[PDB]
Design a protein around this ligand. Structure first.
Ligand SMILES: CCCCCCCCCCCCCCCCCC(=O)OC[C@H](COP(=O)([O-])OCC(O)COP(=O)([O-])OC[C@@H](COC(=O)CCCCCCCCCCCCCCCCC)OC(=O)CCCCCCCCCCCCCCCCC)OC(=O)CCCCCCCCCCCCCCCCC
Ligand SMILES: CCCCCCCCCCCCCCCCCC(=O)OC[C@H](COP(=O)([O-])OCC(O)COP(=O)([O-])OC[C@@H](COC(=O)CCCCCCCCCCCCCCCCC)OC(=O)CCCCCCCCCCCCCCCCC)OC(=O)CCCCCCCCCCCCCCCCC
Ligand SMILES: CCCCCCCCCCCCCCCCCC(=O)OC[C@H](COP(=O)([O-])OCC(O)COP(=O)([O-])OC[C@@H](COC(=O)CCCCCCCCCCCCCCCCC)OC(=O)CCCCCCCCCCCCCCCCC)OC(=O)CCCCCCCCCCCCCCCCC
Ligand SMILES: CCCCCCCCCCCCCCCCCC(=O)OC[C@H](COP(=O)([O-])OCC(O)COP(=O)([O-])OC[C@@H](COC(=O)CCCCCCCCCCCCCCCCC)OC(=O)CCCCCCCCCCCCCCCCC)OC(=O)CCCCCCCCCCCCCCCCC
Ligand SMILES: CCCCCCCCCCCCCCCCCC(=O)OC[C@H](COP(=O)([O-])OCC(O)COP(=O)([O-])OC[C@@H](COC(=O)CCCCCCCCCCCCCCCCC)OC(=O)CCCCCCCCCCCCCCCCC)OC(=O)CCCCCCCCCCCCCCCCC
Ligand SMILES: CCCCCCCCCCCCCCCCCC(=O)OC[C@H](COP(=O)([O-])OCC[N+](C)(C)C)OC(=O)CCCCCCCCCCCCCCCCC
Ligand SMILES: CCCCCCCC/C=C/CCCCCCCC(=O)OC[C@H](COP(=O)(O)OCCN)OC(=O)CCCCCCC/C=C/CCCCCCCC
Ligand SMILES: CCCCCCCCCCCCO[C@@H]1O[C@H](CO)[C@@H](O[C@H]2O[C@H](CO)[C@@H](O)[C@H](O)[C@H]2O)[C@H](O)[C@H]1O
Lengths: 105, 52, 35, 103, 62, 96, 78, 231, 168, 227, 135, 85
């Protein structure tokens, strides 16, 4: 819609002000910021880096709507059957008495 | 001049094509087999006994 | 006079088109169909 | 003065149009063509019989059978295939002769 | 865009322009093919095919 | 000779490999029968046994393409993950 | 046991259900025209824009009516 | 399998060659909005916002040569297939979308995260973002489906009505000479009125559907355009 | 030497005759896939390193400067360390075609060389196999042609329930 | 200029001498550029040396800024002479075209040979070093001028049309400058009258916001390869 | 050097086939190059006579093609299936019999979904041949 | 049904059939013929463009280990849901 201007360094709120799923992950809980997705989302919104939330989503949709959709439809593995036809590992081996051709030399 | 000549030739060609398509060309795969081809295979191997 | 065509108009009324000023106006008040 | 549409010949203008005017569209079109010819370019015999004929499949002459017969005859004759080989029949030549004498 | 052109005032004027002459000929064909179908397909001597129940499109498409 | 049963009902409870092999054997049997008839008649085999040979060919193509999956760690893990006791029991207590 | 059944007359039932969609179409047209009269009453000079937009929408509601009618004919003649 | 067939435009191609060997002005365009994207002066865009004009004009011409002339009896809409229209719309829509994505400006997608900071990010804003990213592809699908089905339904209805008209006209015209001629005359007048109404409706809807087919693409383009102000 | 032109026919034949694919050949193909992934990873790492090295000083300062998204303290320390390491010495920071070439040509060369040599390795592996696929590979390299229906000609091993066809 | 057999023979005859001359010019120009680059890195402004980032206000795409990313070395005469700078510029053009040709050769292996024949049949994209006589140099310059004539009008029309359709000048002096800027070469344009158009366009579009199509036209007009 | 990329590299003289080309342009321009022939996106002209001429011609050639190439297949299928299931069996009939059968097929086409259903549904007790007549 | 039959192309002229194996093999032969000459080194972008993606796809196919059955692409009959063979 309207032009977007990146916030200045002084306009960015401190990390400690961000909230997680339950509450702020302040001192003694900073390392939990890496694992809390909601805290990261709130931090990105505060820092005006909202694209981090939107770009992965849209692209993913595109990737599904273009390339993986048909790949799954045409070459994907369906559910296995009840009675499974496992491989006996008997096929392929050369028969007894066969004289294979020599390798290149 | 160039476009006039080109379009004259194109018009003649399209007239011939229209006549052939809508008055002479038989539709393929006829039920009675009296008109049109039934199709055939192409690109078949030739002179490759090892293939079989 | 001959039966030849003239400057094409595209079926537009030059007295109300978006570029009407580009067409000169005669004494009768009818804008020309050509420059 | 120079202009692509007025001065260049048709193939050159086509290349310019689809390379420096609508390149993404051409790329996507080629992608879609490849997909169509890779996954939507086959028709089984049953499908042809059901829907492949204007008025219906003329079973009274079975054109598909004749087409396949001509195909296989041409392949056999050109490639010099011995259709009597045990792999094709599943039995030895002598067994085949015995069966022929039996039936 | 339907802006202009010759427009006959009534039937009698359709002969005042070659294009409208062809148009009225085509209209005559269109409207006169119907009475022909009435006469042909409602004739006394028309008889249904005795073998009409042997085969029909209804069984074929079904 | 005896043709195997490859009807839908029989095929339903059969592994893919067995069905493919049965179809191939049936095609071979039909081809050899046609060849025997042609030899008895004395006519050339190519002029009579083309369609049967083609059927054998297509069955060979279908049979040689399929490789039954190897039973390994990941395959067994997938099979056990999908077929839980819950799902197997539900199937056992269900139609078809 | 495996049982395959083919009921003939069911195609009639589906046909009637599709026709019900027209109830939401015919009413939709009345809503547009109902609003049109009110709009024309308070802006008589601007009747041109209102009437044109009413007929434009009537076609974008008739399309949906044609959507259902096609399915009805498919399930009635096939 | 390779099928060889021909489009149903050969006569129209001949007419185009005959009548357009010389230049002529064009003033009436079905979708005129592709030429005037900016209405407030001093606004300009650095993106190639006028790239869609040529494709829009060609698509309008092609679809008009097909759909409008399809009203004529026995005329065939050679392209009338669901997946073919899907291919067309895929080409156009995805080409423009990849043009926007290749720009490598991630901030352009900021508007996808609907709403303001005051709404829960994970449970409100993010869900709505997912729904909108889904809505883009749904818009593509909707465009192609609408274009296909409007034509299919209209032509089905026309064929059915024409069959009924032929039946009654051929096998019940004799009633003109009978005592129940009034009923037949009423029915015939009703059928003529319906015939005219159907033809007018189809003629208007064929052009409206192209307006909307091009408008969807232009809306996709506009959803990512940013205008600078001259100073 | 161009191994791909020879190997394409063999791969197509294996796909058509995948039924006779022994577990050894399957492991060979899995190793080929793993090595392709490894080559991709190393090429990507090289490309990222070249991009970082040629990045402009201002670009590095913006990327590896304040603010800190997490502000844990380790993040800032690592960013400062990397920024100091990059900005200490002089770095050739080209732009345009120059950066494109510098960043890509090494990556393309590395990826192509690794993949070509891995293809040669896979060809050697298939040559050393004692299965029907190995025999087919040796025959292809010898006569220059792919011999289809080879498994049924030499009567390659089949399951105990599928040896009837060989009964001749 | 269209290809010709005479030009093809000329370029084929002088191919190897041209390559040798190009190599010598490459050595000389590398020396000159090394001097210039060292001077820029030593005495250049902090923004110019650090390659300060300037992003467009709409899509935040980086591009060179005329004020920050361009610097005039007023004291370059001490180290490098004017003739050396001209030599460097000419070699930059020739090296650009040769680099494009070499890239095509490397990419397509031995399949570029017929395209090389097409290349040698025209003087548009051959290096100046391929001309060993005054007449050959004159023909080469004529080809370059023909390319410039072919390309420039499109760039001028693009600029003028975009501005005139998306904006108008503020005052009468700017109007006169804009109108007189795009006059044909047959008439003489007063630089003083035309200068305010520079500020006006700075208000409209700076060099950091130049569009890709306009850039392609400009490169065509400057005999810079674009593919 | 082999082929020119510019349209100005003429392959023929300016006066080649001047007369026929001028006649063709005269045919094209007389009705189309007029003020009232304002096209809508090049597809719908403003001249009434263009519609009046082209609509009948398009309909005529399309109908001829449909009747002599498309519907003929259905007619032949009906004739074959209802009178032996083989082409020779149909040819064993006379031209008049084939005319009768084809006109009955046209009757069925005209009836379609509103005609009597006895044309394809055999009423119980009917003495006419059934579906298994030729089986 | 009958109304539905009116929406088909009306200018079908010829139909040609070709097995995937045959024309794939012919294309491979053409590609080998054009990529064989010595003046096209294996490390050139053109050769890699020609070969690498095909090799990757074929390798992905070979490594495939699916617990389900994928019916033959070119069966005589694929219209039956209860008969994958
Ligand atoms: C085995 C049997 C034979 C068949 C073999 C086939 C082999 C196939 C190989 C495998 C292919 C696999 C993939 C197939 C995919 C197909 C998809 C498809 O069809 O989609 C529908 C789609 C439909 O398109 P469309 O919308 O109808 O428009 C295409 C039209 O061409 C119209 O579009 P347009 O108008 O925009 O086109 C431009 C047009 C612009 O307009 C024109 O130029 C006007 C003319 C138009 C011509 C084209 C239309 C054809 C009309 C029907 C046929 C005409 C009559 C033929 C009579 C035959 C009699 C037996 O210009 C041209 O067409 C240029 C050609 C002009 C030729 C002029 C020749 C003049 C000769 C004069 C000689 C004088 C001699 C004097 C001697 C005097 C001595 C004293 O088809 C296509 O898009 C094209 C598909 C083509 C695929 C390539 C096929 C391979 C090439 C085969 C060539 C065979 C030549 C040998 C034949 C010998 C006779 C039997
Ligand atoms: C600028 C673009 C703008 C325009 C965009 C337009 C498009 C719109 C967007 C949406 C997309 C639309 C789709 C259109 C069609 C496109 C084609 C398509 O979809 O094909 C998919 C299709 C997918 O394959 P598929 O055949 O469908 O099926 C999968 C098969 O497995 C295939 O088998 P494969 O052998 O080919 O395998 C490929 C492999 C992908 O590539 C590989 O083969 C392997 C991976 C390569 C790595 C590359 C380097 C990574 C970075 C290295 C470090 C750099 C920094 C250095 C300095 C460090 C200092 C410390 O993919 C996978 O299967 C996944 C591998 C996963 C490996 C990791 C395992 C997980 C654990 C480890 C990670 C987690 C650690 C956290 C632990 C917890 C800690 C608390 O083909 C591919 O794309 C795959 C082949 C090509 C891969 C290229 C690898 C290089 C990637 C570089 C990307 C760098 C930029 C991204 C970030 C940008 C940031 C600004
Ligand atoms: C036959 C050959 C086949 C080749 C195929 C390969 C592809 C084509 C090859 C190259 C073709 C030539 C042309 C390429 C484009 C040139 C663009 C250009 O003009 O750039 C000028 C530009 C120079 O201008 P500059 O002023 O110096 O700097 C630019 C400004 O910064 C600009 O300033 P700004 O303001 O614009 O700043 C923004 C700028 C900032 O970026 C830059 O400019 C920096 C440079 C790029 C950095 C990219 C890496 C970022 C970090 C990646 C981290 C990944 C971690 C993953 C960890 C995984 C762990 C498991 O752009 C971005 O922000 C874009 C970031 C990238 C986003 C990527 C999104 C991908 C989405 C994927 C969707 C899903 C895919 C499918 C599924 C896959 C997964 C299953 O060039 C560069 O800076 C670098 C150019 C590099 C060219 C590509 C090199 C190709 C090497 C190929 C090696 C492999 C060959 C394989 C062959 C296989 C057999 C045939
Ligand atoms: C064998 C493997 C092959 C692999 C496949 C290759 C396929 C072909 C792709 C193209 C490859 C290059 C072709 C040769 C170009 C000539 C050398 C060169 O760079 O000239 C400078 C010149 C630089 O242009 P610029 O715009 O002035 O540069 C701006 C910079 O700011 C400039 O910076 P500055 O302003 O500070 O000024 C510096 C200037 C100052 O110097 C001067 O002024 C003195 C003159 C120096 C340049 C002289 C060039 C002479 C060119 C002609 C040579 C003779 C030709 C003879 C032909 C006939 C033979 C019979 O010096 C430079 O120009 C240095 C540039 C930086 C170095 C670039 C080279 C990097 C690659 C080489 C190292 C590879 C290591 C591999 C390690 C592997 C580890 C595993 O090159 C160009 O004209 C650019 C190339 C134009 C064609 C581009 C085509 C697309 C390329 C896409 C590639 C994507 C990645 C690869 C994958 C592709 C997949 C599709
Ligand atoms: C020994 C030497 C020293 C060593 C080597 C040194 C290095 C040399 C190499 C580097 C040289 C660079 C400089 C080159 C300059 C010249 C370039 C050029 O071509 O100029 C035009 C050149 C004439 O130049 P000019 O007269 O000087 O005019 C120059 C002007 O300045 C006009 O200038 P302009 O700007 O107007 O012209 C530009 C025009 C240049 O173009 C043209 O002018 C067109 C040229 C062809 C026209 C053909 C017309 C005739 C057609 C005939 C058709 C057949 C007829 C029937 C034949 C029957 C035979 C029995 O347009 C373009 O530039 C367009 C570029 C398009 C790029 C396409 C990129 C596609 C990328 C794909 C998408 C990828 C996306 C990413 C995907 C990523 C996925 C992971 O054109 C020709 O000479 C035409 C030649 C026609 C030959 C005959 C027809 C073709 C024969 C084919 C035979 C095939 C045999 C095998 C068949 C096998 C079947 C199985
Ligand atoms: C009666 C049943 C009716 C069913 C109807 C179902 C709907 C059908 C709709 C059809 C019409 C609409 C089609 C729209 C378009 C669909 C597109 C689509 O999904 O196609 C995907 C498909 C997927 O391709 P694929 O099927 O070959 O995938 C191979 C994947 N393996 C090997 C694992 C099996 O794409 C194509 O068909 C084109 C592929 C070639 C072009 C792209 C090449 C570049 C790829 C880049 C990434 C990988 C390489 C590394 C990077 C580059 C290195 C150089
Ligand atoms: C490049 C060939 C090198 C080897 C010499 C081959 C000579 C073969 C004998 C040719 C005799 C007839 C020549 C007639 C004049 C040809 C003129 C010509 O080529 O013009 C191309 C002209 C188009 O030109 P424009 O793009 O409009 O503009 C041209 C101006 N730039 O093309 C045509 O019209 C087609 C003309 C075809 C003529 C025949 C060409 C035959 C070439 C065969 C080459 C292969 C070797 C032959 C060896 C023969 C040994 C006995
Ligand atoms: C420029 C880089 C040059 C590198 C040169 C070689 C460096 C030294 C060898 C590196 C290690 C190789 O060791 C590698 O181990 C992995 C397992 O981890 C093996 O891989 C094996 O197990 C993995 C387990 O996931 C399977 O996916 C794979 O299919 C299987 O082959 C590789 O077959 C083997 O090659």
């Amino acid at each position: 819609g309207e032009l977007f201007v990146r916030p200045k360094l002084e306009e960015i709120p401190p990390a400690d002000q961000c909230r997680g799923f339950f509450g702020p992950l302040n001192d003694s809980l900073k390392f939990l910021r890496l694992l809390d997705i909601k805290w990261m989302m709130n931090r990105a919104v505060a820092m005006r880096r909202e694209y981090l939330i939107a770009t992965p989503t849209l692209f993913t949709f595109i990737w599904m709507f273009t390339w993986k959709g048909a790949v799954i439809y045409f070459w994907g593995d369906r559910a296995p059957p009840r009675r499974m036809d496992w491989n006996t590992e008997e096929t392929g081996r050369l028969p007894l008495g066969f004289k294979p051709t020599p390798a290149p030399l | 001049e160039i476009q006039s000549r080109k379009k004259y030739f194109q018009t003649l060609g399209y007239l011939v094509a229209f006549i052939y398509l809508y008055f002479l060309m038989p539709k393929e795969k006829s039920f009675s087999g009296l008109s049109g081809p039934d199709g055939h295979w192409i690109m078949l191997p030739k002179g490759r006994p090892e293939l079989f | 006079v001959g039966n030849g065509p003239t400057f094409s108009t595209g079926g537009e009324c030059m007295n109300t088109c978006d570029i009407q000023n580009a067409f000169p106006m005669n004494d009768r008040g009818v804008r020309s169909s050509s420059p | 003065v120079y202009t692509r549409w007025k001065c260049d010949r048709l193939p050159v203008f086509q290349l310019k149009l689809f390379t420096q005017e609508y390149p993404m569209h051409a790329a996507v079109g080629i992608f879609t063509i490849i997909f169509l010819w890779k996954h939507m370019s086959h028709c089984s015999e049953e499908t042809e019989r059901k829907y492949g004929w204007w008025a219906g499949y003329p079973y009274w002459r079975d054109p598909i059978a004749r087409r396949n017969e001509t195909k296989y005859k041409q392949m056999i004759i050109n490639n010099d295939v011995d259709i009597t080989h045990p792999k094709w029949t599943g039995c030895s030549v002598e067994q085949l002769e015995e069966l022929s004498r039996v039936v | 865009m339907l802006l202009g052109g010759f427009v006959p005032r009534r039937f009698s004027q359709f002969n005042r322009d070659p294009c409208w002459m062809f148009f009225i000929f085509s209209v005559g064909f269109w409207l006169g093919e119907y009475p022909a179908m009435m006469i042909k397909y409602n004739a006394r001597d028309l008889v249904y095919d005795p073998h009409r129940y042997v085969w029909s499109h209804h069984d074929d498409h079904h | 000779f005896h043709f195997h049963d490859v009807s839908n009902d029989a095929i339903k409870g059969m592994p893919p490999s067995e069905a493919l092999h049965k179809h191939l054997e049936n095609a071979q049997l039909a081809h050899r029968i046609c060849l025997a008839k042609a030899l008895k008649a004395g006519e050339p085999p190519v002029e009579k046994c083309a369609l049967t040979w083609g059927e054998v060919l297509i069955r060979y193509q279908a049979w040689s393409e399929y490789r039954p999956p190897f039973q390994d760690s990941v395959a067994q893990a997938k099979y056990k993950k999908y077929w839980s006791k819950k799902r197997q029991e539900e199937d056992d207590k269900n139609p078809f | 046991s495996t049982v395959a059944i083919s009921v003939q007359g069911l195609h009639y039932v589906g046909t009637g259900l599709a026709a019900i969609a027209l109830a939401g179409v015919g009413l939709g047209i009345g809503t547009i025209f109902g609003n049109l009269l009110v709009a024309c009453a308070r802006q008589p000079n601007l009747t041109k824009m209102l009437f044109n937009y009413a007929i434009l929408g009537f076609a974008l509601t008739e399309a949906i009516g044609l959507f259902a009618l096609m399915l009805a004919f498919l399930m009635l003649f096939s | 399998m390779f099928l060889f067939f021909f489009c149903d435009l050969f006569w129209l191609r001949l007419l185009l060659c005959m009548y357009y060997c010389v230049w002529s002005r064009l003033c009436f365009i079905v979708y005129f909005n592709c030429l005037m994207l900016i209405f407030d002066f001093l606004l300009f865009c650095l993106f190639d916002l006028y790239l869609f004009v040529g494709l829009c004009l060609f698509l309008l011409l092609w679809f008009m040569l097909f759909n409008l002339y399809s009203l004529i009896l026995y005329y065939c809409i050679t392209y009338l297939n669901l997946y073919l229209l899907f291919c067309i719309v895929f080409l156009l829509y995805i080409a423009f979308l990849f043009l926007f994505c290749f720009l490598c400006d991630f901030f352009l997608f900021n508007n996808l995260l609907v709403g303001d900071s005051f709404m829960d990010v994970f449970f409100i804003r993010f869900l709505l973002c997912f729904l909108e990213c889904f809505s883009l592809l749904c818009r593509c699908l909707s465009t192609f489906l609408r274009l296909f089905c409007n034509l299919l339904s209209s032509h089905f209805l026309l064929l059915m009505f024409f069959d009924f008209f032929y039946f009654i006209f051929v096998f019940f015209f004799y009633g003109v000479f009978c005592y129940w001629f009034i009923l037949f005359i009423f029915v015939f007048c009703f059928c003529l009125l319906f015939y005219v109404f159907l033809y007018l409706l189809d003629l208007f809807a064929a052009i409206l559907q192209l307006f909307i087919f091009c408008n969807m693409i232009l809306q996709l383009i506009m959803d990512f355009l940013l205008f600078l102000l001259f100073v | 030497t161009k191994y791909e032109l020879k190997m394409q026919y063999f791969d197509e034949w294996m796909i058509r005759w995948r039924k006779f694919q022994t577990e050894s050949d399957w492991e060979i193909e899995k190793g080929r896939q793993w090595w392709r992934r490894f080559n991709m990873a190393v090429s990507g790492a090289l490309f990222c390193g070249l991009v970082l090295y040629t990045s402009g000083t201002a670009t590095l300062k913006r990327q590896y400067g304040l603010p800190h998204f997490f502000d844990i303290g380790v993040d800032g320390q690592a960013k400062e360390t990397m920024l100091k390491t990059l900005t200490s010495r002089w770095r050739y920071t080209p732009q345009g075609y120059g950066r494109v070439l510098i960043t890509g040509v090494p990556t393309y060369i590395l990826f192509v060389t690794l993949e070509h040599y891995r293809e040669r390795r896979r060809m050697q592996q298939y040559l050393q196999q004692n299965t029907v696929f190995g025999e087919q590979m040796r025959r292809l390299l010898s006569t220059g042609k792919i011999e289809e229906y080879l498994p049924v000609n030499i009567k390659a091993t089949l399951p105990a329930s599928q040896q009837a066809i060989y009964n001749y | 200029m269209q290809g010709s057999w005479s030009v093809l023979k000329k370029n084929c005859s002088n191919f190897f001498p041209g390559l040798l001359a190009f190599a010598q010019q490459t050595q000389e120009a590398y020396g000159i550029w090394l001097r210039i680059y060292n001077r820029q890195q030593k005495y250049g402004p902090t923004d110019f040396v650090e390659q300060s980032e300037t992003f467009s206000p709409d899509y935040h795409k980086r591009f060179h800024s005329q004020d920050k990313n361009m610097w005039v070395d007023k004291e370059l005469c001490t180290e490098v002479s004017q003739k050396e700078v001209a030599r460097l510029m000419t070699y930059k053009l020739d090296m650009w075209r040769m680099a494009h040709c070499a890239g095509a050769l490397l990419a397509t292996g031995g399949y570029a040979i017929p395209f090389g024949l097409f290349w040698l049949a025209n003087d548009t994209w051959v290096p100046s070093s391929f001309n060993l006589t005054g007449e050959e140099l004159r023909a080469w310059r004529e080809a370059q001028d023909l390319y410039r004539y072919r390309s420039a009008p499109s760039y001028l029309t693009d600029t003028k049309w975009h501005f005139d359709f998306h904006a108008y000048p503020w005052n009468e002096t700017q109007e006169r400058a804009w109108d007189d800027l795009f006059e044909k070469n047959d008439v003489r344009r007063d630089p003083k009258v035309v200068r305010p158009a520079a500020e006006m366009y700075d208000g409209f579009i700076k060099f950091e916001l130049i569009r890709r199509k306009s850039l392609r036209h400009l490169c065509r007009s400057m005999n810079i390869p674009t593919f | 050097v082999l082929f020119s990329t510019y349209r100005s590299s003429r392959l023929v003289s300016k006066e080649f086939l001047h007369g026929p080309v001028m006649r063709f342009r005269a045919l094209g321009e007389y009705y189309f190059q007029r003020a009232w022939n304002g096209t809508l996106n090049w597809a719908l002209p403003g001249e009434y006579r263009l519609y009046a001429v082209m609509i009948p011609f398009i309909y005529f050639y399309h109908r001829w093609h449909n009747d002599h190439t498309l519907d003929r297949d259905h007619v032949e299928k009906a004739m074959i299936m209802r009178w032996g299931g083989t082409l020779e069996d149909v040819r064993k009939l006379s031209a008049k019999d084939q005319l009768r059968v084809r006109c009955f097929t046209d009757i069925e086409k005209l009836y379609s979904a509103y005609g009597p259903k006895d044309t394809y549904l055999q009423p119980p007790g009917d003495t006419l041949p059934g579906k298994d007549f030729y089986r | 049904s009958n109304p539905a039959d009116h929406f088909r192309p009306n200018l079908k002229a010829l139909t040609l059939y070709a097995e995937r194996q045959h024309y794939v093999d012919r294309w491979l032969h053409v590609k080998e013929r054009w990529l064989a000459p010595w003046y096209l080194p294996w490390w050139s972008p053109l050769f890699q463009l020609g070969t690498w993606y095909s090799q990757r796809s074929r390798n992905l196919f070979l490594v495939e280990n699916h617990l389900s059955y994928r019916p033959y692409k070119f069966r005589r009959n694929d219209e039956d849901r209860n008969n994958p063979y």
